[PDB]
Design a protein around this nucleic acid. Sequence first.
DNA 1: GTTTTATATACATACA
DNA 2: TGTATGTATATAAAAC
Lengths: 100, 180, 46, 46
Amino acid sequence: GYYELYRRSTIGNSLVDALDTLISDGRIEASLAMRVLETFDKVVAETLKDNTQSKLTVKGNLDTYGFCDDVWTFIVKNCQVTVESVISVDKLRIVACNSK
Amino acid sequence: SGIVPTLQNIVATVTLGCRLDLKTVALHARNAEYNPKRFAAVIMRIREPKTTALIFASGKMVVTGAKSEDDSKLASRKYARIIQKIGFAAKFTDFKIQNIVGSCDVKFPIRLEGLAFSHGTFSSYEPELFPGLIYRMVKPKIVLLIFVSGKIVLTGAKQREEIYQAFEAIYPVLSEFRKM
Amino acid sequence: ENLMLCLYDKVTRTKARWKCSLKDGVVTINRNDYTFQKAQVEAEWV
Amino acid sequence: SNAEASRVYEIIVESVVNEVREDFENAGIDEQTLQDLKNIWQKKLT
DNA sequence: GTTTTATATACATACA
DNA sequence: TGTATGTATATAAAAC
């Protein structure tokens, strides 16, 4: 259970980098690092589920889309994003995993 | 008449000659979908010619949405190259146009019930089920969708001249049942 | 680098118009981070 | 710029650390090592 | 059952 | 209580 996609996020990469250091730089038990990441996967999921309110709206040109193995990938170009403020992005990559 | 039906869609078949691993194609082709739980094929799309392709594991392929024989074959070739570039030993064999759809506007209302009764052998009209009259022509084996507004849909053709001839045959009947 | 990670509830298409109902996600847009409960995507393919 | 994001991020760090502590204690590593993980992670995250 | 295209009705959820 | 999307109905054709 729990997808590992959130490890690619800013907070996820940071965690990876921290752990990698404790392993290499130090002598801190690897494998435990994996245990930690398994915890991360679950936490981010419940937190994003129970601790969020924002509603986003993304409108733009669909440059590319794709589906395989319960994962949708989209690349939106020249888009305006609305938070609940209006932000503009030249290129946005979206990766979505099945909710079911 | 000076009214020539407009081609709206062409469906074609092509044999690539090799077997394909759909997942590999999906993972390496842009704008492709692969959901074996829905349809056992890879759905792939290109913008020019704006068409859609149903690619199969057998190497069999169907291309739709083209509006001309040239576009149909061109798109088909494009999908072919894309598959080849992915690493599959595909070939472009047996390209065949299987269906051509066309439509036109006569610009005058039509008395459907009347049309149906006079040509009962070919006509099917249940406005409550579907608002158009389903006219099955035997001459060029073409099926026409006749509407009270004077708009016509013609389908089931192997070549465009069939769409054309089917309309020339029906036109007199349309004038014959003009509602004005 | 302008990456959105999330879950999808529904994805639909009509002609070249796509719509997507996203949930529980995180995005980095122009060096800033947003977290959301829901997101709707309206994109036009060519 | 988003505040909910930083709050979510805070919840994630705090929540993960406390959970991970059991395993950390099992592996007989070090409470201050866990503290380092927390500080570095939060450091990288900026 | 998929995908594409013209055409036309009813009906069904939403939205301010 | 309109403007919006959606569902459905019906046609040809191939591939699975």
